[PDB]
């Protein structure tokens, strides 16, 4: 009737892939895999993907394809008491578009600064460098003071981010114009690439979601030839089976697979909404998850061969140079490694292009999910001019991310990365899977999938939908809420007001679910049983 379809069946696959792959498969998976037993981490990763990731992925895809609605309009067909899921997802997507869209701005600054035969972060006689600028080893005669720092680390913490002008999260100091201009350019690109919808999206995804693979292959070929590259591959693949006895490895595997596949976020619902009715979403979800896992593996190889080259040029124990987890592994360590390799300009250019193209499609999908959701929710005031309400949300996200462009921006982006996403998204996805597999009835869902696909899913899928994945998400939630992390960044701890603000932000989205079921008191008054029986059952189709 009014919904649109993908231009090609490959466009949907490429869009879901580009949404699934991001920097979380480049700098987040290799570090977690090496820290948690090395090569022995692939077994719990595979187990948690088979039990937790693929079932939720396939359920979400089938649901979004059948009901043909976003993250807000679909709940009128399952449980109208959980309509606040869409608003909570909108809040979480606002927070994510605020914080995640700054890593791409840093990558863009590095890209526009790398246009020189001699990269800036390979020297030390600059205007941003202090006396602690000790160049890369290249020799073992020069000692290393505890205050000494590499030139690339100083270029990252004093030029591109300018963290030395802010004394910490207590005072951001001021906003920079360079990062502001880069993030404005990238937001303009996102808006001019996501305005029309899936028909225009699937045409840019052909370039944005396929370019990272060519660059990954080029970097793999370059790293496998560097001297001492076998050490990185060995340390990344040599298993440590003693680690598998601790629950931390399984918790980290569950978290990594849930944040790499990313179910329960309304993006998959929106993408499957624009899909055909009789489309075999089963094969689509399977191949998407397999491609995501294989991309994580290939990128781990790519990163660790270069870290092994570094540990051969510098001293050994890649674990020592890979001490920090975050964007520093890509902007400090890998930056040094690129600046130290022959033909550094081209490699830096393609690496930063890969980072930008890995973030771009992820932001595309994250914004298109909320756009489709609110459009299918409010078709009377919107969805008649889709060119609007996208500029509005882009401007809102830009004004919300302006606080990250300040000099103390790393602190704010880490605070938003460590509190706004994890527990809120986990609880949202858990309660969504509960509402779909328990309240909506697993029989009404299995017969539905049998009608659409032509065959009812196996008993394994019913087991993974009713008991396995809900207990999985509940386990992740209980593990995250039990150990509040004391996060630190660049030798700077976080005060208690920071933890309070992070707790308030993390609950600023999940709290949208109970307030909806409470404020519905005015809409449907009467006896409690009346509400319980009128809010669970969906409206007449």
């Amino acid at each position, epitope marked *: 009737g009014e919904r649109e379809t993908w231009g090609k069946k490959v466009d949907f696959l490429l869009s879901v892939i580009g949404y699934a792959v991001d920097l979380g498969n480049v700098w987040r998976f290799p570090y977690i895999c090496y820290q948690n037993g090395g090569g022995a981490f692939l077994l719990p990763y595979t187990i948690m993907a088979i039990f937790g990731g693929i079932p939720l992925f396939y359920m979400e895809l089938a649901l979004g394809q059948y009901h043909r609605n976003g993250c807000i309009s679909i709940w009128r067909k399952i449980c109208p008491i959980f309509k606040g899921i869409g608003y909570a997802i909108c809040i979480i997507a606002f927070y994510i578009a605020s914080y995640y869209n700054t890593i791409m701005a840093w990558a863009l600054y590095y890209l526009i600064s790398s246009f020189t035969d001699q990269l800036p972060w390979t020297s030390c006689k600059n205007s941003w460098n202090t006396g602690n600028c000790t160049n890369y080893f290249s020799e*073992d*005669n020069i*000692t*290393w*003071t*505890l*205050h*000494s720092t590499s030139p690339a680390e100083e270029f990252y913490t004093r030029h591109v981010l300018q963290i030395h002008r802010s004394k910490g999260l207590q005072d951001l100091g001021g906003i920079s114009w360079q990062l502001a201009l880069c993030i404005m350019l990238i937001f303009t690109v996102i808006y001019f690439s996501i305005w029309k919808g899936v028909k225009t999206s699937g045409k840019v995804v052909w370039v944005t979601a396929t370019f990272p693979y060519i660059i990954l292959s080029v970097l793999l070929v370059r790293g496998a030839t560097l001297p*001492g590259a076998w*050490r990185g591959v060995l340390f990344y693949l040599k298993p440590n089976w003693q680690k598998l006895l601790e629950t931390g490895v399984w918790i980290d595997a569950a978290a990594q697979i849930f944040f790499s596949l990313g179910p329960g976020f309304g993006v998959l619902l929106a993408f499957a909404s624009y899909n055909k009715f009789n489309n075999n979403c089963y094969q689509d979800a399977l191949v998407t998850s397999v491609v995501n896992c294989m991309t994580s593996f290939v990128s781990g190889f790519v990163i660790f061969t270069v870290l092994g080259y570094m540990a*051969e040029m510098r*001293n*050994e*124990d890649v*674990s*020592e140079v890979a001490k920090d987890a975050g964007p520093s592994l890509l902007f400090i360590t890998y930056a040094e490694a690129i600046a130290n390799m022959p033909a550094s300009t081209f490699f830096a250019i393609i690496f930063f292009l890969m980072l930008i193209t890995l973030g771009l499609d992820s932001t595309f999908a994250g914004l298109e999910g909320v756009i489709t959701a609110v459009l299918d929710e409010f078709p009377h005031v919107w969805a008649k001019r889709r060119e609007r309400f996208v500029l509005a949300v882009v401007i809102t996200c830009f004004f919300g991310s302006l606080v990250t462009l300040t000099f103390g921006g790393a602190y704010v982006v880490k605070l938003l990365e460590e509190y706004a996403t994890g527990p809120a998204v986990l609880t949202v996805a858990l309660i969504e899977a509960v509402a779909v597999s328990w309240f909506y009835g697993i029989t009404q869902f299995c017969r539905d999938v049998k009608e659409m696909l032509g065959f009812s899913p196996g008993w394994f899928w019913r087991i993974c939908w009713v008991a396995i994945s809900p207990l999985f998400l509940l386990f992740i939630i209980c593990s995250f809420l039990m150990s509040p992390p004391q996060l630190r960044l660049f*030798q700077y701890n976080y005060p208690y007001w920071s933890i309070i603000l992070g707790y308030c932000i993390g609950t600023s989205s999940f709290i949208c679910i109970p307030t909806y079921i409470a404020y519905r008191l005015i809409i449907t008054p009467g006896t409690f049983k009346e509400r319980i029986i009128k809010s669970i059952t969906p409206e007449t189709p």
Partner: antibody
Amino acid sequence: EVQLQQSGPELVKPGASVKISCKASGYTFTDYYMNWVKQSHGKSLEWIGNINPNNGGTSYNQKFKGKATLTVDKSSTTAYMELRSLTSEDSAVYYCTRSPVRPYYFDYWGQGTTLTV
Amino acid sequence: DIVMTQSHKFMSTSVGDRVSITCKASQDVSTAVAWYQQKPGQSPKLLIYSASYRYTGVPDRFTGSGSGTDFTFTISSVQAEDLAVYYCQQHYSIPRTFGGGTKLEI
């Protein structure tokens, strides 16, 4: 020209708890590590722990989980190592060592506290 | 852990010859191998770090060689003031581990 001073010999009751102080002087104390090594009687050396006088960081050996705690007081540039639950099996000479960050060569060594149980 | 062994604790040639003791490494350490000189009763002083660079303030006679797995301490024609034990420390990974050592008699 740059020597690290320590305490002298003492008698430790088996099962009690004691400490070993390392007063460093000669260079910028807040610029390098402060590592402890345990040399058993007529045997090989053994690295115990690591101290970062900039932020009180620690990095101790795996075989020294609950054997020695490491603290630092950069007021008079000293290094403390409390030995808890000491028996007659590890009581030996204790050296205080400084080492830069990751060439990790032990530059200067203490005088040698022959800690006898 | 990264265990580091040495040769026998007795075989050492007298003055005039070349006393060269070895250090077998468990894992592949590129060049991160140091050497120390602990005279009887004194504290160990640094002699050679990274297996090829001698520390500032040591005589030119003390030379280190070897890389990868076989590390050799080359102290030829020992004088009357080199009788000590020499340990073999690696800078690969925490925890760092020393070696057994060997005396140079006579």
